[PDB]
Amino acid sequence: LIWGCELNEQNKTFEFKVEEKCEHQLALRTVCLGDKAKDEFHIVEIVDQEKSVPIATLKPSILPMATMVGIELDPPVTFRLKAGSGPLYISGQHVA
Amino acid sequence: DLIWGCELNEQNKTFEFKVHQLALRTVCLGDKAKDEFHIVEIVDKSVPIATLKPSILPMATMVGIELDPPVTFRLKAGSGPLYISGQHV
Amino acid sequence: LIWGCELNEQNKTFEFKVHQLALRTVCLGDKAKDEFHIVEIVDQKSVPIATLKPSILPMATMVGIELDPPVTFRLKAGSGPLYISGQHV
Amino acid sequence: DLIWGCELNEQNKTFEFKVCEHQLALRTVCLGDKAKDEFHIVEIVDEKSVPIATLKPSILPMATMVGIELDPPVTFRLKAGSGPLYISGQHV
Amino acid sequence: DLIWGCELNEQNKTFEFKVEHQLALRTVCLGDKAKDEFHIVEIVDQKSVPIATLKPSILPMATMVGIELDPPVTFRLKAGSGPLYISGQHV
């Protein structure tokens, strides 16, 4: 199944988790802005312990999405909107 | 192994791919699309997967996205033409 | 190994003529007019695969598009020169 | 498995990555939101420097790196620009 | 395996990768002083095949995926002044 989250200013941080192990990874597929996103740089980072790794920088009028290739993560994973108001959408898939 | 494609627009905001797996390859705008952000998502949960705008980014390459039918593509925003392309796999 | 064509305003078509073609990139030449070019794959019908435009996106990387002969490439919109590259797989 | 990243910027232009064996697979390069609006170039140093990415905030603020798998130690340097420029990768 | 690259420019429009082992291309990118014009790079099968078009204020680099090449190959700057840089790995 396809997975998605939305990061935005009210909800800057989203923790993806899990009812089974199983060992399934989350493979990122794309990151993309909503069409009422403010016209400013939006930066999405992966958080783990404190270290975060920026992985995408976007801006509506410059670069509104990015294709993610090869990123496979071990749950639990935390995504965070380091900069920007969003909506910023992340998509992915379950992988074995 | 052989090419598939759909078209979404204002009067056709949806396309069900029904009855193997679909590998997406590209999403791109037609040349008369209006100059606005277009968002296409997968519903089966709604998950956006591309945001495009003719004078900013008129296409994207999709990598790794392989889907089991049935899946519906929706144009969450924008009026199209927006084309999705892919391959049976 | 390496292969490519050139579609343009005279030559809108190129037929890849009968194992397997892996597209690599599609890119515009430096004198394409500044307009939307669209390239579709035609079958034995039609699936737009790249939208480009010199001052917006003048090339794209193709990933995962592997084709069985025959297949034809059409310059649906635009003057060209537009170049496709590929590799026999 | 675990995600890796580094920040190259004007103060710290060079970042040396050091570790049963394990390559570093790069995933993305991207600019910070206060980077100056100028071209940033990043290169791998081994002395021969090979540039791998050029970015600029108002033109192309990030890129996806595909297939670049490196054997430690690797050195990243900011050939141009002041950053922040962020690199992400995975142990593989 | 190991990192390879070359600089192509107006004075040196060609670079020949010379001789088992293929070259997997990774990126192409422009220098911060390239002029603001379309640069094109093609593989010369010595049919030259363009593989990239870039321009500093529109698109200053691109990611190559799946291009693996047997030497001898030659890369040619079909337009543009450069510096244009190409990167790759021996696979």
Side-chain angles (χ1 to χ4, degrees), chain A residues 2-18 20 22 24-96, chain B residues 1-17 19-44 46-89, chain C residues 1-16 20-43 45-88, chain D residues 2-92, chain E residues 2-44 48-91:
Chain A
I2 195 91
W3 167 95
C5 77
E6 177 187 328
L7 312 178
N8 55 47
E9 70 174 313
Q10 280 97 226
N11 295 303
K12 296 194 185 63
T13 296
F14 187 99
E15 307 164 66
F16 168 90
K17 190 61 282 168
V18 142
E20 91 232 24
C22 244
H24 279 193
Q25 307 195 104
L26 178 58
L28 295 194
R29 296 288 177 232
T30 69
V31 163
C32 78
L33 301 176
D35 58 342
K36 307 311 187 148
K38 269 165 177 39
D39 200 355
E40 57 185 21
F41 283 105
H42 285 72
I43 301 178
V44 44
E45 65 189 340
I46 291 157
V47 179
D48 201 35
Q49 20 55 334
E50 232 226 47
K51 207 206 169 148
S52 39
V53 173
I55 59 166
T57 300
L58 305 169
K59 173 165 160 174
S61 65
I62 298 322
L63 190 68
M65 62 168 292
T67 298
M68 301 289 100
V69 177
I71 304 168
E72 330 214 286
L73 295 157
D74 243 293
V77 197
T78 300
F79 298 113
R80 174 158 74 195
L81 189 62
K82 194 178 162 106
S85 77
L88 171 158
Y89 305 122
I90 304 165
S91 73
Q93 287 185 287
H94 303 297
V95 126
Chain B
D1 59 20
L2 95 96
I3 212 99
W4 175 85
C6 75
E7 173 179 343
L8 317 169
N9 62 40
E10 184 53 32
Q11 294 91 43
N12 283 302
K13 292 201 185 137
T14 261
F15 179 100
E16 179 154 41
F17 163 81
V19 316
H20 286 19
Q21 273 206 324
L22 185 70
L24 296 195
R25 301 287 182 218
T26 64
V27 172
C28 71
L29 295 178
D31 70 347
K32 289 320 171 207
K34 276 167 277 198
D35 204 358
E36 51 187 21
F37 289 105
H38 285 70
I39 307 187
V40 30
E41 50 193 10
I42 292 165
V43 215
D44 38 26
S46 230
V47 179
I49 65 166
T51 304
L52 310 163
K53 178 178 180 182
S55 58
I56 312 309
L57 189 70
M59 61 160 309
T61 294
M62 305 283 105
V63 177
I65 294 183
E66 315 207 328
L67 299 159
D68 292 310
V71 266
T72 307
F73 307 102
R74 192 153 52 205
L75 191 59
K76 162 187 183 68
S79 264
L82 177 163
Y83 305 117
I84 308 194
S85 79
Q87 286 187 286
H88 303 99
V89 120
Chain C
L1 230 40
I2 208 49
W3 167 96
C5 55
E6 169 165 337
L7 320 193
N8 61 40
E9 196 177 0
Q10 332 312 99
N11 305 280
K12 294 159 170 262
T13 79
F14 186 101
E15 356 178 330
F16 176 61
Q20 273 197 340
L21 224 209
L23 299 179
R24 295 318 182 199
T25 67
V26 180
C27 64
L28 305 176
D30 51 350
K31 299 298 183 215
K33 280 166 193 180
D34 192 5
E35 58 173 25
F36 292 108
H37 288 49
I38 297 186
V39 29
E40 66 190 342
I41 269 171
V42 188
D43 243 5
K45 300 267 151 279
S46 279
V47 174
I49 66 149
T51 301
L52 302 173
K53 172 170 184 186
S55 56
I56 310 318
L57 187 67
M59 65 159 294
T61 290
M62 314 288 93
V63 162
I65 302 183
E66 254 133 83
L67 307 168
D68 276 332
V71 276
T72 289
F73 298 97
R74 200 162 132 258
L75 201 60
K76 178 173 171 174
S79 72
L82 161 164
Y83 304 114
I84 309 181
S85 68
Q87 274 185 302
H88 303 289
Chain D
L2 211 146
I3 198 92
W4 167 91
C6 70
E7 168 176 345
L8 310 170
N9 58 41
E10 201 170 11
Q11 318 93 78
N12 287 317
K13 300 197 185 45
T14 298
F15 184 99
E16 174 181 49
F17 162 89
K18 267 193 218 103
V19 82
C20 335
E21 77 64 27
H22 305 336
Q23 303 254 245
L24 187 51
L26 300 185
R27 303 299 184 210
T28 71
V29 175
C30 71
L31 297 183
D33 67 322
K34 298 311 157 219
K36 267 166 151 229
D37 192 10
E38 58 187 12
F39 281 111
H40 285 62
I41 291 147
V42 49
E43 75 190 341
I44 292 160
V45 189
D46 92 5
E47 179 134 319
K48 55 124 158 343
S49 289
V50 172
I52 57 168
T54 299
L55 295 175
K56 181 175 168 172
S58 63
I59 308 314
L60 184 71
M62 73 169 278
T64 294
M65 294 306 65
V66 163
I68 304 178
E69 319 205 297
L70 304 156
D71 233 42
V74 226
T75 294
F76 305 91
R77 176 162 77 206
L78 204 45
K79 177 182 191 39
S82 271
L85 181 139
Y86 305 109
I87 305 195
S88 62
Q90 284 190 292
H91 312 291
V92 317
Chain E
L2 194 47
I3 202 75
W4 170 91
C6 59
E7 176 176 330
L8 301 171
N9 54 37
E10 197 73 78
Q11 319 330 123
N12 314 262
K13 309 184 170 186
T14 274
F15 182 97
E16 184 183 5
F17 175 69
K18 263 192 294 54
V19 274
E20 209 163 9
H21 286 345
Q22 339 195 256
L23 178 68
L25 287 191
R26 301 292 182 223
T27 68
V28 168
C29 70
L30 300 176
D32 58 342
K33 325 265 183 196
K35 284 192 293 199
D36 185 8
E37 67 198 348
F38 290 105
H39 291 55
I40 310 209
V41 21
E42 52 184 5
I43 296 327
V44 180
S48 49
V49 179
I51 60 166
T53 305
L54 300 175
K55 172 167 183 194
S57 53
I58 308 319
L59 187 79
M61 65 173 287
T63 285
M64 317 280 92
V65 173
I67 304 180
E68 298 192 349
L69 292 163
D70 279 301
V73 262
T74 293
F75 295 104
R76 170 171 192 258
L77 198 49
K78 185 187 212 47
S81 74
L84 180 122
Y85 303 111
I86 304 175
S87 60
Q89 290 175 294
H90 307 292
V91 285

